[PDB]
Amino acid sequence: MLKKKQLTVLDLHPGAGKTRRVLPEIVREAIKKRLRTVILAPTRVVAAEMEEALRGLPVRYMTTAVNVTHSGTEIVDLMCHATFTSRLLQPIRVPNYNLNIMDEAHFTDPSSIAARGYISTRVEMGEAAAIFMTATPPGTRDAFPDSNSPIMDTEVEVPERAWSSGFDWVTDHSGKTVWFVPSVRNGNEIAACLTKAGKRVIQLSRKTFETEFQKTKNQEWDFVITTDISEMGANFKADRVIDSRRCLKPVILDGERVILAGPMPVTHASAAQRRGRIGRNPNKPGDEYMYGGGCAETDEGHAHWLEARMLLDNIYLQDGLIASLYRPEADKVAAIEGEFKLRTEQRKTFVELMKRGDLPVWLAYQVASAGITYTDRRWCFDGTTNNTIMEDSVPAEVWTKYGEKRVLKPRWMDARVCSDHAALKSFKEFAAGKR
Numbered sequence: 001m002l003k004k005k006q007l008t009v010l011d012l013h014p015g016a017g018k019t020r021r022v023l024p025e026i027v028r029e030a031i032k033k034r035l036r037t038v039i040l041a042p043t044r045v046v047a048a049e050m051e052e053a054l055r056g057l058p059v060r061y062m063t064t065a066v067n068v069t070h071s072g073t074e075i076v077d078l079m080c081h082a083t084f085t086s087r088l089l090q091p092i093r094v095p096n097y098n099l100n101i102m103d104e105a106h107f108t109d110p111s112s113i114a115a116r117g118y119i120s121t122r123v124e125m126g127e128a129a130a131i132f133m134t135a136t137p138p139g140t141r142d143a144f145p146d147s148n149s150p151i152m153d154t155e156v157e158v159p160e161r162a163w164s165s166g167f168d169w170v171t172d173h174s175g176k177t178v179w180f181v182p183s184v185r186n187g188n189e190i191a192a193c194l195t196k197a198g199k200r201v202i203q204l205s206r207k208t209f210e211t212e213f214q215k216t217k218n219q220e221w222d223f224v225i226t227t228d229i230s231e232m233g234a235n236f237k238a239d240r241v242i243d244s245r246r247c248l249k250p251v252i253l254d255g256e257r258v259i260l261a262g263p264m265p266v267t268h269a270s271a272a273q274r275r276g277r278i279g280r281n282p283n284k285p286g287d288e289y290m291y292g293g294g295c296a297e298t299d300e301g302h303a304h305w306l307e308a309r310m311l312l313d314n315i316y317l318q319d320g321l322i323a324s325l326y327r328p329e330a331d332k333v334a335a336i337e338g339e340f341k342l343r344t345e346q347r348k349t350f351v352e353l354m355k356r357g358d359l360p361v362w363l364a365y366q367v368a369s370a371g372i373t374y375t376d377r378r379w380c381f382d383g384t385t386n387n388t389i390m391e392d393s394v395p396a397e398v399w400t401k402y403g404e405k406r407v408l409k410p411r412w413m414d415a416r417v418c419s420d421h422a423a424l425k426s427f428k429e430f431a432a433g434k435r
């Protein structure tokens, strides 16, 4: 695998031991061969599990998620996918790693897609080797891959709202269930319904993942209600997955706004990863996968692939050259390579709107490409009436940094800034000049 100009897809089935058995062997061989190596974890939680798998190997953990005193003599770095793309974008020296290992390489967040594009381009240039670890590489059509033990697969109607009757099978179960929902708001409703029926429920989403995931270890629970983030190597001691088979798809309309379309079917890759949370113990056959819909290739036209091109257009590669998306996922977007390349000061603004502003890539790009500086929030208030953001069926209101109460009405409307109460709270703070 470790020969320059090679990209290997390590596609062993979910739970085959890619992270705990194969990765340490790759890292040992890399160190023997004096390959400057990066290991890319999708989340802080996976980063911490990798430290356990790699314990004693000389690895620099470029994350506060791990408490280790480094030798200063590691030639293997571990960081999150997002950290890699972030450091590429910033005026910070990122080593030209000889070996690029991406764990949970199916992750479809923009920074993960961008990271794959950059890495696969360096490999295509003959500059580096790469290993993408995933059961479900891009364009996989198999929602039912092999498992460590047999899974009972049942197509069944799955609730997406509170219910009073008609789903006894949900609550009659005595084991532990991981339940994939299409949104935080949908999980909040199902979670309240299960809590009312006497169940102990933990909710996971991107924003809450590290804190809340720890509860799955520290307390007894009946249900984990999770968004798609738990597709990314999150492991549970569960005997059932309930899968809505639905997700939200961000869609750019007319180059002008972003809506969260759906819910609509997940990809085969997503369904396989959701299912893949169970059947992982060869000694516990008969874990259950209950699935409420079909799969479809809903990554086609999904805004994350356009956002990945906005990131890659702003990463230095060599002179004016620009990294391509990883070939198998390159047709998910219709983008002119280099169309999103920004001049130095607009690029810095773009980066800061994402890193400090916590804005979605697309919205950060609209603001930066308009020549607005990071701290200039006038655009959060001067949009069309139809861009009015609503809070409890009334226009959301903030006090501007000038001390004026205004309706939140952004010039560019990205549905991700108000997809749930926490998102809207964060965006209100942004519009008020509080970060």
Ligand SMILES: Cc1sc2ncnc(N(C)C)c2c1C
Pocket: 060, 061, 062, 063, 064, 066
């Ligand atoms: C961005 C970096 S580089 C780096 N190197 C070593 N340790 C680190 N931890 C302990 C904070 C980091 C972080 C977070």
